[PDB]
Amino acid sequence: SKTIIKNIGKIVSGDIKSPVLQADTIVVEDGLIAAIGGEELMKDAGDATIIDAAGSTVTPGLLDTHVHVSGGDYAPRQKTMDFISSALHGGVTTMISAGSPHFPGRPKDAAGTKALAITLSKSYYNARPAGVKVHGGAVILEKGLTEEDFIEMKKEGVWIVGEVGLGTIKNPEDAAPMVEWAHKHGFKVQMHTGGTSIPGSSTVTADDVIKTKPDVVSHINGGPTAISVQEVDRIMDETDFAMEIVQCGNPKIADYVARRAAEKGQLGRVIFGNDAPSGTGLIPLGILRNMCQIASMSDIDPEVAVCMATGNSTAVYGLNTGVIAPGKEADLIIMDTPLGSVAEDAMGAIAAGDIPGISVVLIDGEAVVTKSRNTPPAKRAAKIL
Amino acid sequence: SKTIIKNIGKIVSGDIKSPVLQADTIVVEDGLIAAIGGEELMKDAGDATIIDAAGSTVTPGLLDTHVHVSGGDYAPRQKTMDFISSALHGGVTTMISAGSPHFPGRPKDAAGTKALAITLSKSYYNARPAGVKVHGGAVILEKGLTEEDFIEMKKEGVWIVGEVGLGTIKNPEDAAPMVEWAHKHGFKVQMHTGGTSIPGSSTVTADDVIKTKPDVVSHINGGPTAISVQEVDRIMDETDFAMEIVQCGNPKIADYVARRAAEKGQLGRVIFGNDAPSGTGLIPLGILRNMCQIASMSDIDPEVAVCMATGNSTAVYGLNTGVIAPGKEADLIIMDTPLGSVAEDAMGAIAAGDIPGISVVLIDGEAVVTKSRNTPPAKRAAKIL
Amino acid sequence: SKTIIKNIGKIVSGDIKSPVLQADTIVVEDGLIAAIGGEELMKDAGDATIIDAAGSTVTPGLLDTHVHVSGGDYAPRQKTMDFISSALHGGVTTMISAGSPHFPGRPKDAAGTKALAITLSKSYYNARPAGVKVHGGAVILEKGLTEEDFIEMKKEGVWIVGEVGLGTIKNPEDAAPMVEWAHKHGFKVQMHTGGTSIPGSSTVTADDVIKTKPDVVSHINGGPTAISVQEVDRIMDETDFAMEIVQCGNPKIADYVARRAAEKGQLGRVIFGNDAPSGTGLIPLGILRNMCQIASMSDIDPEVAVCMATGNSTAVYGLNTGVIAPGKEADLIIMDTPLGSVAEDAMGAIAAGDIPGISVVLIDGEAVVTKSRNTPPAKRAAKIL
Amino acid sequence: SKTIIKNIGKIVSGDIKSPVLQADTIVVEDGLIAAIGGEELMKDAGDATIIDAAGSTVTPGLLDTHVHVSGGDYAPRQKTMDFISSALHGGVTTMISAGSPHFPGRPKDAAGTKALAITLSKSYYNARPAGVKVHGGAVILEKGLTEEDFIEMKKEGVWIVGEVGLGTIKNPEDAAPMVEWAHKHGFKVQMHTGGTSIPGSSTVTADDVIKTKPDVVSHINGGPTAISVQEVDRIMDETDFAMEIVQCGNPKIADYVARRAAEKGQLGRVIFGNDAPSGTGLIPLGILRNMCQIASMSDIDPEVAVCMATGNSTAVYGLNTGVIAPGKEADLIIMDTPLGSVAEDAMGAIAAGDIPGISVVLIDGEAVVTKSRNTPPAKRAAKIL
Ligand SMILES: [Cl-]
Ligand SMILES: [Cl-]
Ligand SMILES: [Cl-]
Ligand SMILES: [Cl-]
Ligand SMILES: [Fe+3]
Ligand SMILES: [Fe+3]
Ligand SMILES: [Fe+3]
Ligand SMILES: [Fe+3]
Ligand SMILES: [Zn+2]
Ligand SMILES: [Zn+2]
Ligand SMILES: [Zn+2]
Ligand SMILES: [Zn+2]
């Protein structure tokens, strides 16, 4: 099966190292990006499906690196149905679970936290809600977990540790040994960073992070309560861990992180999540909002903001997507400046603070959205011929 | 019925003329604020309910000036139950309907748009969801409405015109005459400002706004697509209309509006809404987020950010609330810096970009929240004795 | 637009005077039943859509004469989303509102009850949820309504009065004049019959019904509390009003009503509703269950039970549907005995107490269901070729 | 902690061996029934909570032995929120999971079905929705499960096998060995008995049941499609397994089973469930309706129908509740004839076919309902003094 997207005004690659591709044509074959170039690719198109981008912008499908899933497409935290479908219409094609703290009666012992992670991992792989690639089993560390539990979880398809600090495992002395077992058996590890619900140890320090050694510093701008700029500095300077900016966090610290990362050349490490469902709410346009806020308020190139939502995120998680390059999964968005925006194109809209209009979303090359029900309308909508 | 709130660390009034009150005790009598002062008000307490603010902050209950209600506490736009109850836990005690475009099969003729406005106006006055004061009937202007229709609507308790532009009445030549009739019969009038679903008339200009003469320029920072800075300049400089900053809008333009309003002495005109339910999502902490955003990013005193969410808004709508002053309705929040925040108090938290922890919320003096289920935890929680 | 259903094993007409049609082919043209006959009707089919009934049974689409709607497809009484599309998968193609007592903060004055009925009438005609024909505006009688109000409502498309007794109008002395105005202006009238919430007047008598003169005696078997058999006798014998058996009512009295009506030649007056959403629940297979219950427990022929759910109901309401006859609206079900049933066909299943499997549902000739998501599976499924 | 219920007009025990207790006073101590008797028990009450039954009826809290839970209080099958809370208002204080077929993306391998059962078992014991005792982890048998899997599940608190036939284990030849392992390690076993979704083997026979050896013959009257009377007779006569009559099943077969069980002395084996959520709907008054239907249509004493909903069910599952006897868990309903009913008391109402009014529900002696939101109003309401 073959699909060609033609007449592309701008291709944003999602790769921070070279964020724009000098090409106007993308060929998709058997769910993968096959070729990127010019009109020469249209000869020998055969019976391909043709999508006319009508001069608009193609980006990778967005990742939300911080979703609190609990099974299927219902969110108990805010009593919301169909929230994953809604996020897809905001461009989100892959979701990473940050753990399931809202699972009703969440099992908090070692066997229970394990069984829940296994359940959610298998269930989301069995059924992609609205076609979204949900990596749904992110184990919450609890006292009593052994190395064999991590071996068992890996056997059953679990490969993510959810926010360290959500369970009974909180201080680095207890966390580090488990994080070590996790890493030894192929897990990616997240860590809650910011204000906590405990009057004793109310915040999370750089030393905590440094000693625990997560792959991802979760909500570095707070969830929603932020760590100090002093601790931000130490995390940025003393580690190479991913620095996750979340929509449901502190915008001042988000700006600080973005600006300092630009100063220090650390933008490749910045990844976007929602941290929702949460007390804040549920925001299907959350990742686009992150991109618009960072680009429009923190003086980051909109193409680089796209990388923060896409390739930066898949780089940390080791996924074969989030980047427009041959061999990568064909998860793609066709978007434009929205009607009435001062901006001439999608990247211009992002830089101006306007959420772009999404026309088409592909997952594995298949059209799963042909007009977003959530974004404002694209000025130039893609047409599937 | 009498309630006394004692041991208050800071009183934020909601009145931009004097944002802080140098007092530590508040007396509530028969649903109204009766006295503001020192410990002398504790004399002859009697059977009064005593609330210990534990050295934290008292503000007015927040207004959301831009809610798209549709009956009760269910939002079809994002398939969300109990969203008003949720907003209450983010401090929202009064909501203004911006109209009901999501009402299923929304009647779009003159008789139908009127009937729906009357229905929702009466229904929300009959049943306050979770105790929230919802002004739920905001008529959407459609072709065929007469002055008599406005007289009838006023008789039946309707006094708000929802975002002009949501219905078939769009251009100023059609809108102006109806807004005249509305204003003649005691209505407050809202107007959609920014990008629209119309390709031909893609944006709403300042000329449109100046000609139509609404009381409120709805989502001046876009819903979510913003007008140009040049059009913002003109609305700010050529009118005295309220300028509504919404959570589901352009953050760059929100910053521009706030900073320019500060330079031009127009901060009293700025009011906060969510513009939700919408494509963006549903954000019960949305008004708090507006406050933190404007305070931490636009260099606005957090006390004045409170005014934008409270007294500025009730001033525009002529409501006897949103201000801590004798004779005003006793809608009050007790809040603090959240656990782990670098800030020492609630106002400090807001200026730092951290959502404050809400402990207690009163509506008409009655405790409707005793611990927020949505905000981070307050460092010092108020206790009802 | 033309559709032909061929290879029909049994046609059940919905007309109690002739419950079975000796034919095996139905032609639908422009949303209406055009012809019923044999294979000759297949000649020169041309571009026609062909549906192979696979030797199974065709019946009219079912009516639910007692639905408590409140706008769109959400039911606040039991916090249920998409209940109307669910009922469609139980074969329900038309719904009659019995009033909207669950509308949150339901307006209870004359002007409010009017405004709500107009709103719901218009909204449901604007948007058929899942394609279902919902007659959604059934005014609840309240003190203060005048004849001019009924004139206004009729002008705006309202033609139903909901259960008399749901509002402040309760006793026959107050009700009779209003019902008189209703009937004068072309309204159909329902009346609550059974146990009430008032300790003083705890029940409804035949005298009440005789004096009030509704078209439909709502929930004659109770909603859920039944009137006595003595009162049932008088309603059956002293009036010609429709006798509505509801799913959410008393099964002993349902049986009594069915058996006595058979004895007295009054089966044409028996009509089926759910009386849901209600305290009992929400039962999308409710009308089918009524048919199965009456056929299997009350010794009523299954074909006559079909009439009670279809033609008996549309006759009372004067709707051009519910009967398989030329010129009637092409609302049709193709159904069969369910897998594993002792019965050999759909009617046999109903008589045996087994809910039939629904394969196809047409509304105005368009396929809105091609396999029921709610019924057990049909042994022989219809196929659209 | 002590509670006394006084002024009771009738006590229905839930014990089929002695269905009525000739007493008017019940003492509850530390969550258990302490004593049953007369006025003498009111002596030296002290600080005991006193509940005045107002001359109405006390029964045990009802069981629903066939609930398809899937985590928390949301039901995906019918998109219903808060269904367990709703069932509590229908008197349901204990639920038995029949398995979780509706879990989104339900894991179907051995490891996954195990993980899911462990998760649900633990989660429902951690958090009782609305106070309801949910036995939530009922494993669905899948090919690949071993005796060791059952040892592991038992260790983690799982003790129920959900309907045999929901998963890849369908043939009695495959099921019997697994059911043996379950019984060896303390499990109670359910078995789907009725029409299936496999055309090849479309039903379940008595021989299937005899070979499999479940504890409960699930939905003996169909789910919703019934087995034949021929198979019913043999199950009744050749096994001593529990015969579950479900609300979402065939009423003719329900009547056949109840009547034949009365003739054969087998009423102690009859237990009640809903089989919901299901295609039929969600019926919070479903257990009450079961009692009303069997008492009013099948000539079963209403006190015996209560046993079928209570003590019969807890006997099968080995639970220390369902019966008013000293030492049993204090799960109790106070109920009456509903307003307007021909019946003078609660049992009379059930026999008459009228759902009784529930005033108070206790779980572990704690008042979880003080007025049912779902049943009609009790004539005489209990009052906590
Ligand atoms: Cl969190
Ligand atoms: Cl809008
Ligand atoms: Cl009712
Ligand atoms: Cl089932
Ligand atoms: Fe966190
Ligand atoms: Fe707008
Ligand atoms: Fe009724
Ligand atoms: Fe079953
Ligand atoms: Zn989180
Ligand atoms: Zn709006
Ligand atoms: Zn009713
Ligand atoms: Zn079942």
Curated annotation (Swiss-Prot), chains A, B, C, D:
Binds 1 Fe cation per subunit. Binds 1 zinc ion per subunit. It holds the Pfam family Amidohydro_1. It catalyses: 1,4,5,6-tetrahydro-6-oxonicotinate + 2 H2O = 2-formylglutarate + NH4(+). It is an enzyme of class 3 (hydrolase). GO terms for biological process: nicotinate catabolic process. Its cofactor is Fe cation; Zn(2+). Belongs to the metallo-dependent hydrolases superfamily. Adenine deaminase family. Homotetramer. Dimer of dimers. This is Enamidase. It comes from Eubacterium barkeri (Clostridium barkeri). The gene is Ena.
